[model samples]
Target: MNIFEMLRIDEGLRLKIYKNTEGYYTIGIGHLLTKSPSLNAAKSELDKAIGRNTNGVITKDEAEKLFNQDVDAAVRGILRNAKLKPVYDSLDAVRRAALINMVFQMGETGVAGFTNSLRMLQQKRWDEAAVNLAKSRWYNQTPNRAKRVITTFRTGTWDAYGSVTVVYQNGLPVISVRLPERRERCQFTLKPISDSVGVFLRQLQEEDRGIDRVAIYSPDGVRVAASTGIDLLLLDDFKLVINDLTYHVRPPK
Candidate 1:
């Protein structure tokens, strides 16, 4: 079977729109359903391709077609993302499918957060790319399946992974950062800074999103933030996903 075929078999097909392990509506092989109307439209086209979908039930042939369409769309997203596209287009079909699969499991914006890993992919630094992929909680979450994707980086071979086993929530712009692992939360606010409101990232997260030019001090009088500024926002505007949590890397949004 071809790469997409292989992934469909590995991913297994699901009709009737059931919730995957993560509790999100998923249908026809592994497409995550989104609340966004945009994604719903995309699903409608898949329905058209099916010739028929009754109450969301899809047969194997239809599911296979849906998988191919989704993979193509995932690749298209990678292409549009720019930073990851060139490297992706350079890969062999299997390797390209593997990268596309990563994007499929993690939303386009979610995968975009892998700054260092994608950089390594562009450089063709196989070892570093492998290292970067493994270093993240992404690897810890799906070691066996992700290994196949990692293998592509280490000179050659299929790397594996997924969340039909969901580990990260997708596409939320970083409004409040809940560092659940650390049992800490860094939240924000928007207040007037003259005409434009001040934006602060890396602020005392739980505290109010502040516009004032003031330092954040703890109850013990220890300074936690010397200056919380919009400048702390990620320049790439990428969404960040860590373990089971997702955060947008932008400031004061």
Candidate 2:
């Protein structure tokens, strides 16, 4: 799915100037005149699209031109956001299109504020990512649009909110979805530390800098503690899990 098609339907078409839900002066399929160089720049283009002074109104063709430009800017903005780059790179076409739609509606900086959501998306945790969207004001303000966007993130499909064709399977609508490739997390046993747990952690980080969480478990199949600085003295035979992978801890050789 492409950003242009998705946004055209999502943003809707407008021929004349109108205030968006946020009270920003917007026109021509979610194009914000307030963010432009000047209203006259848009007005001049509107005039050029129809070869006549449009008097604050634009034709469908003119709106199409503006839509293309807006989508281009949104794409560039998404690519420029440093925190989003890796996450963006890891997504499929439909998921990437979902992001472009988000950036178009909310701008780069606005979307960047979703720190937890972005991390979930980067890890390909669709359910968690969708849940994170609910915590934002955007989800409350734009309920229908937010639902569609959230579904797109979770399902990796353009069929959100009946936007795509569906088939009935046993009286239930069936929609196709694509899942991102599952990347295997790093898994390895740590050489039992004779010196310090801190040193072991540092070595682990050096091996896989992407480690986010570490949980130590007891032999009784219960989580002992999570995160940094666990007291290893309390357990005789325990398990170590880093970033959701079990690591067999070996005795110091």
Candidate 3:
């Protein structure tokens, strides 16, 4: 009646087909039964593949071969379904395992291809990821298995950057600060220190500027602030101070 039910029936039939075709490594026949019923008719065809038994008793070897053959065919069937083609095309090798697992549980025809989702995955843009499992024609035809697979996919929270702080400034676009590892403290002072002072501070948030360590002093040559450690480079503009002792505030980089 629902997607899960369809999956259950499909899996059951797959198991039966596997059992029937075990041992023999034939190809391209097992999946026919997945789309059809009438086990009695199937058994007759299977018998012809192995050999006719006078008393109609199938041998262990024959059954094993048939089951193996069926499995190969069934898996191929699962991949060949129109809906699943996009899934195959979209995923890379690393993510393919999970996608294939879903295909096995839900069958190809019922599970629609994840086009947009796949593009995001390829680009490693993990922030916009979601599990989109829906009931299909096969799902309505068989319900239990489809629900199970959907539930499994929705289980965990996926994140792109594991433990990185993404910082964004007005001029500087995207800068990722690695927290707790290489720690550096920055202080802004209101004084005309040097032209390199502003360029140096702005480099911490910019991508590849050049200068790393910089120390800026006031007009009276008093050490106001400094930055050290990590891949910091380049200096922009400096803040202006009205008095000598008091550290006034100014616009930041």
After the best TM-score superposition of candidate 3, give how far the Cα of residue 160 lies from its true spot, in angstroms.
24
lDDT of 3 at 114: 57
User: Residue by residue across 12-76, what tens digits does model 1's lDDT show?
Assistant: 45556665554556677687665444645546654665665455566655666778788888878
Candidate 3 positional error at 134, Å:
2.4
Clashes of each: 13, 0, 37
lDDT of the structure predicted as candidate 1:
0.54
**Where does model 3 exceed 4 Å of error?**
1-40, 52-64, 74-86, 89-132, 155-253
Strongest candidate by lDDT: 2
Error of 2 at 101 (Å): 0.6
Candidates' RMSD to native: 18.1, 22.7, 24.8
Per-residue alpha-carbon lDDT of candidate 3 for residues 96-138, written as tens digits (9 for 90 to 100):
4335545543435434455555454445454443333343443
Error of 3 at 96 (Å): 4.5
Report the C-alpha displacement of residue 110, candidate 2, in angstroms: 0.7
Model 3 residue 5 lDDT score: 22
Candidate 1 off by > 4 Å: 35-53, 159-253
lDDT on C-alpha atoms for all candidate structures = 0.54, 0.65, 0.37
Instruction: Supply the TM-score for candidate 3.
Output: 0.32
User: Considering TM-score, where higher is better, how would the candidates rank from best to worst?
Assistant: 2, 1, 3
